[model samples]
Target: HGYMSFPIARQRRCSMESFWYPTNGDGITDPMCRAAYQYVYDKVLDETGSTTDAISAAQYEFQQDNEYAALAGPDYWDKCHITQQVVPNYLCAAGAHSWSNPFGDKSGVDISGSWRPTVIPLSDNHQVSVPLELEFCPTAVHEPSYYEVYITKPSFNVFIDRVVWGNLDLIYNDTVPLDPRLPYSICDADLVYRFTVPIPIRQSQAVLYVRWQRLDPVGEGFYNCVDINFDYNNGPDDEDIIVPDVPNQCASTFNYNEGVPGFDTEEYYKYMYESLRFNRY
Candidate 1:
């Protein structure tokens, strides 16, 4: 039901592609999105053993982009929790297995390939001076307790590595009270819940990861992977990188009406403290 709006998340972008071209997802212009569709098509066909079913399944998952990539029912960092196998590497997809998401795999989005990254320019004059507004849009209210935002260190390479938790640097953690007027941001329905993260001008290409943990003790958290191109006044050379077209915010936010993807399990993970919370695996 939610996702990072600015510097669009991988799933969010793919969803838009599906929305814009539902019947012809393979024809998506974005290289990464196309490949992701290809991944889903192949994976679903293998799982369902039906070419016809695969087509609909792939399109269905991608279209509900805002639904969620969530660790549905555990203090994620725990080892025994169902998602323990997928955490760290599958951070982008929150690969928790279920009937809807067989093998609990969204590894398609985890591919190490040419994904069009959003280009953000920052000043070389100061360390962490430029403020990047990190926004998470919710279709409706869920009353989250806190939101955490992390940025990859300059050493992390978007083109070469999967976005894992250990490699990321926590930049923002805000404790939000329940039923707030603005919902943690200035105002607005679709663009609500904003966090200001100052970029440390050192990286060339990095990923921004955000987590929204609910207050309901449901043990569910929505995840996002946003590829970023850090443009320090005098930054990386080699102009082969493809900058993606900026998605129109107000117009493109949750264009579809379908609820969270079948893969999401927040509804079922309604109580976990009796079950647990993870400090570490």
Candidate 2:
């Protein structure tokens, strides 16, 4: 019951095309043909309820990647399609349409139970940063397995960020499907991997939902990697410390939603000037 968004589709197509055509317009002609035909057909059908009303009197456009090329010719399109980039289906949504474990008892133990960290300061240029410092222990007979983190904002409006990757090797070595497992105890351990990714936000008062789960490496059917631990910033062993109230002050001060495509004419200029005078002055 969901539909694809143009921006997501454009990103996929652009990335794929980069892999195929690494030179000047060599593989571009064929894609243009297919795109041109599909554009007309899609417009006529109007199956998904999209429009091409950008030609009206307007100033700077608020939409990104609004233009697309048409096919040069049928022959060219045929040749290009084989090498032509993969145009993404413009319909995808998280959780509702996609499931990480579609075929099993997907249960997990809680790792982020009742811990609300504030927005703590990081570097001078950045306001907030999410570091991947995984920590865990082996459960009494339940061997240590895998770990994962889920990040999203309340109401799930527009996605500010997302990432779910860990110990893919567990799957390859026929260990387990790696579901919900938790409250782990450890025998011996060391830092496996680390990554610090920044969260992007458009405004303040944004409530982010961050949940982590671990799974039993020895067992199957959703094991949560409980009791996982990590030194903050993945520092040296001696520098590890408990972090409290880090999420409270990590507010998002950037606003990327100031433009309106419906009335982005000279009115936009007036709006911008008024906004600067009102807020900055």
Candidate 3:
């Protein structure tokens, strides 16, 4: 059986925000029981019109390079969807979840944690966004902060060729800073929040990773060491990018194994070890 998970948010307080603003609910499930990919997709299309959230740089790249005008076109991607293959570690955080320690700002995930090299699919003109939350410690002389989000793919070799097509947050932290008031509530609590990225219904794949750090903290940030639960809404189906003789019907041709020269396996390995090493016996 598959699993359905989400952060244990401040339930009953802002439930609606979790449902409409940051989540893919029953309102927009597609033919394959998947939720709509973009928040604006619900408001923008009846049969033809554009609606998307432009938060993810990777999603933007897919739509710009890979979309087709009609369903019958060769580039039409019916099988497009986000595929999650997580290689988690527990060394970053001592506890099972991210909240094992007090939700503090600028704190490193215990060398034991979990992470994922998420791969997403998109088309031309599809806008996407994601929420990024950061926290620092109180007793540690640092302040809590939230930084800008990133829009990138997992370095898969099939579609990407060392060229970055997503948005760049060169000054993301400078452009978006954290609110001191927001951090006052929990100094050691696991900082939790979500953001949405609207994607163009194109036929390209995307990769992404998450990072959290404080601008004031001295070289301290935690990545892929905590469990992350992301949800996808109305997505491009396998029928959208169907091919006759591939091992998987709608999946990309990139392979993630040893002795392969294309995908970024070394960086992926470092991240993977951080996500799974805690299970050692």
Candidate 4:
């Protein structure tokens, strides 16, 4: 958990207050918050056994409206609402929690033993640029957000490194000099984030995890996991790679709350933006 080494309270604070998005804060400097955040980290390690394991996106299905939202359709986009956006225990409407399909199957499922995989061609040196498409909610439009991509050996667990061409925000004007074939800007509703994966060494297989954590308009996090196979001897599409369901997983929850005491819908957004500023850069 490279990105996670900062502190747990910070994660909880950012994630809870919606600071994980983006804001104008210079960096984390609060002594009290810093100490508390460290405690949260220690507690997580003692209780969970290992906090590093949470970084990888392997085995988890993409959390999107099509796969997880209600059958009534994508209008349910607001189905899960955080109660006290600045606090824990975010609520979820009835049946909405299950609607997100926390336990649902991956979209790559097929019983015929034949699956339509996203073919990514590899060069002789085991390097390749992968192009991918994302399916979003047809019923509603999405807000601007950032997408972070990561990869790890199929056999390893930790995935703290961000892909060179994957860490992108719809707002940032950064240039991906590594890949000119892809676009530097994106639309929220566009949903798709395409990029090249520059592998340093040859490998038989790799796991690609895509993370889209949104902010303004709506506060939510989404992810997609893809297993890739390299074909250096032949070509990128020559290998018949199947997405597998591995055990021991990382997870997320949905929240929906109507009216509870001190339930201020707008206040959550206020704190969400405020908390995001304290980045320990």
Which is the leading candidate under lDDT? Answer: 1
Displacement of the residue 203 alpha carbon in candidate 4, Å: 2.5
Instruction: Write model 2 residue lDDT over 1-281, tens digit each, in one string.
Output: 00011111221222233323322223423353223223333433343342332111000010111121111222322323312421111111111111112221101001112111233333322234434223221222223332222333323322222212211111111122322322341212221122222333223222222211223221221212111111232344333546688656765787545564445667877878887995773
Task: Please report, in order, the local distance difference test score of every candidate based on alpha carbons.
Answer: 0.65, 0.24, 0.27, 0.30
Look at candidate 4 and tell me the lDDT of residue 35: 30
Q: How accurate is candidate 3 locally (lDDT)?
A: 0.27
Residues 40-117, candidate 4: write the lDDT tens digits: 334334555664421111112122223221122222223233212211121001112121234332221111111112
Decide which is better by lDDT, 1 or 2: 1
Task: List ranges where model 3 is wrong by over 4 Å.
Answer: 1-142, 153-191, 196-204, 225-281
RMSD in Å for model 1: 19.7
The lowest-lDDT stretch of 10 consecutive residues in candidate 1 is 178-187
What would the per-residue lDDT of candidate 3 be over residues 64-111, giving only the tens digit for each residue?
111100111231111131111111222112111221123211111111
Per-residue lDDT, model 2, residue 113, is: 28
Deviation of model 2 at 59, angstroms: 62
Whichever of 3 and 4 has more TM-score, that candidate is 4
Model 2 C-alpha lDDT versus the unseen true structure: 0.24
